[PDB]
Assembly symmetry: C3
Homo-oligomer: 225 residues x 3
């Protein structure tokens, strides 16, 4: 394909594909009912990401949205990805910090709102409004990141100073990470146009592989803890 | 905006927004695992309603549907709202009447069908058929309201005559309420055209704030009971 | 209606409708919390199928998709059906083989992917790619059928040789059945065009009534077992 971004989408499809295969094989020999849940989650995330990245690469997950006086290329497929993978990623984190059912419901609902309002902002035909939908979506994220920071910090403490002060390098990687997405959307082609589309695609691809594959490894791992 | 309904959509966005804020603050100081679930639910409902009302106000949640020989303005956004808020509202009621898992599954599935068939009826391009999809949707509602009436009435009894004969003014408000929606859709602009679009918008806005904010307060409250 | 397939869609709407009514009545007199779940599931499946079949019959669930140099009639509604009914059908099977939560999550997630990629393949405007999305979807199915075969075979054993060697004629009917769908899609009008649209509609209608109504009866039944 010609579109400059094909390479980052092709690289994302390759990587997510490799990660889901690695997690499918790693998940063989697991019979513990809770190692099974964590493996179900950790494997499904990159599997969904793989399909959505391929849809963007093959051109299906792409659409044109008029605003600011132009026909802007908007990859709606990402939101379909994030719509299922983010709930699943918080699910893993919540099972981790042995959070209660009500908390899982708040995080997930707030996460649906966050992705749902991002897609509306991503598809709004009136320029200025996109940013209103960007703020509401980021407000829903501060909420999420809030509940998480005190989900990890509340658990980080109940463990030794070598393992307590560690479930901290998970809480921490997970929050800086997520915070990248709003800034990538805002300076990107959906948000402002400060950064070109092929760089924005690169930024999101480096972020997506980090949070689904990279972190998944880190997450799965540090069980004992 | 000019569209006559902007005022009811603006009023709905303001109110839902105020209610979700009130529920976010009220929900601070809750550590009981089950008060947490009820607060998650009660707060999320108006939060989703707020976003969908804003989408209709900003013009995104609106679409044109041809039928009867005209380009009719249909707010598809309402169905996206109801799609998540109604399941969540029955969830609160079911946790209340300590209903079993199977019952929750029947109510929720039947509720998805009810909203799903309302959207199809709302989007059908053949006039007469809209009413077929209206009947199927209302049949799915009688089912819901049925299971609920005997969920509350079954619990209403197990309590004293002062508190039994009360979880009755909840069962009761909840059924009259929901029953309004079909009649508003039928006489409205989606259904018949007996009532104009701006009045229909007013009718739905008075109903939506009553069931998410108004009732939410009433629901949250009457816990002891 | 004229479209040759109306008869199979009309027959599907009639049958699914009859099956859901039969399951609604049969489900009266059930108070056991787990017979309630199985009845919720078994009844909802054909209820959703009924609505989606009617949408296809009334012409709403149909859409035109260009590929191979033609305007091909694609019933998108089937995927909306399968999107909710397949998860629900595996739910019944999983509760049956007393599978754990993690397994249910793997099966369901993989099932969402399977239906999601079938819809993308069904809606792809580039001919060759449809088959790529067909393979990925069938890969997600082998996974499902895999986990199931060892869900039933693992349970098939724990029972006598008369009842063990039986939960085998369920495991078995369920796998041959599902395997039909990919071959019907591939030789059908969405996939290759070897079989005409009205025969493809017939093939899917004979399969859908078998797995929702026919099997539902078989499933519900063989409880003791
Ligand atoms: C826990 C729950 C959390 C909930 C968070 C809620 C927020 C969802 C927002 C946005 C979907 C966008 C799609 C928009 C459709 O534009 C379509 C027209 O081109 C109109 O569809 C017309 C028909 C279509 C309507 C689709 C509604 C689908 C649902
Ligand atoms: C518990 C489960 C309860 C289930 C209840 C089920 C009832 C859902 C009905 C209706 C969705 C409507 C949307 C309609 C789309 O019109 C689109 C074309 O303009 C065609 O989309 C073509 C592509 C799109 C297809 C979308 C399917 C989305 C799912
Ligand atoms: C457990 C989770 C399992 C997850 C499995 C994931 C796989 C879903 C795939 C495909 C949906 C197709 C619809 C496609 C839309 O085409 C629309 C334009 O015509 C563009 O919509 C533009 C707007 C619309 C975007 C809709 C995203 C809805 C979600
Ligand atoms: C695998 C992907 C992950 C972990 C994605 C996370 C995404 C977000 C937190 C996205 C947030 C957004 C906003 C807060 C504003 C609007 C733009 C979004 C949707 C990118
Ligand atoms: C916050 C909103 C609530 C409580 C909404 C409830 C909605 C209904 C019970 C809607 C029912 C409908 C029908 C029975 C027929 C078709 C039209 C609908 C979707 C309005
Ligand atoms: C009531 C319906 C049932 C049990 C449907 C089951 C459907 C499938 C297993 C469909 C599978 C498909 C593929 C593997 C490839 C693409 C085409 C599909 C979606 C028909
Ligand atoms: Cl494609
Ligand atoms: Cl908007
Ligand atoms: Cl229709």
């Amino acid at each position: 394909t010609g579109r400059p971004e094909w390479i980052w989408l092709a690289l994302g499809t390759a990587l997510m594909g490799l990660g889901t295969l690695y997690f499918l094989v790693k998940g063989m020999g697991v019979s513990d009912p809770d190692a099974k849940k964590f493996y179900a989650i950790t494997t499904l995330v990159p599997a969904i990401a793989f399909t959505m990245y391929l849809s963007m690469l093959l051109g299906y997950g792409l659409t044109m949205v008029p605003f600011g006086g132009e026909q802007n290329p908007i990859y709606w497929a990402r939101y379909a990805d994030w719509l299922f993978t983010t709930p699943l990623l918080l699910l893993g984190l919540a099972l981790l910090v042995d959070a209660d059912q009500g908390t899982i419901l708040a995080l997930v609902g707030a996460d649906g709102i966050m992705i749902g309002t991002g897609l509306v902002g991503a598809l709004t035909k009136v320029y200025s409004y996109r940013f209103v939908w960007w703020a509401i979506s980021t407000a829903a994220m501060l909420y999420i990141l809030y509940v998480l920071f005190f989900g990890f910090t509340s658990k980080a403490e109940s463990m030794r100073p070598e393992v307590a002060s560690t479930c901290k390098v998970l809480r921490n990687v997970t929050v800086v990470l997520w915070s990248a997405y709003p800034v990538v959307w805002l300076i990107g082609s959906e948000g402002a146009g400060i950064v070109p589309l092929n760089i924005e695609t690169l930024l999101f691809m480096v972020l997506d592989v980090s949070a689904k594959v990279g972190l998944g490894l880190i997450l799965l791992r540090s069980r004992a803890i």
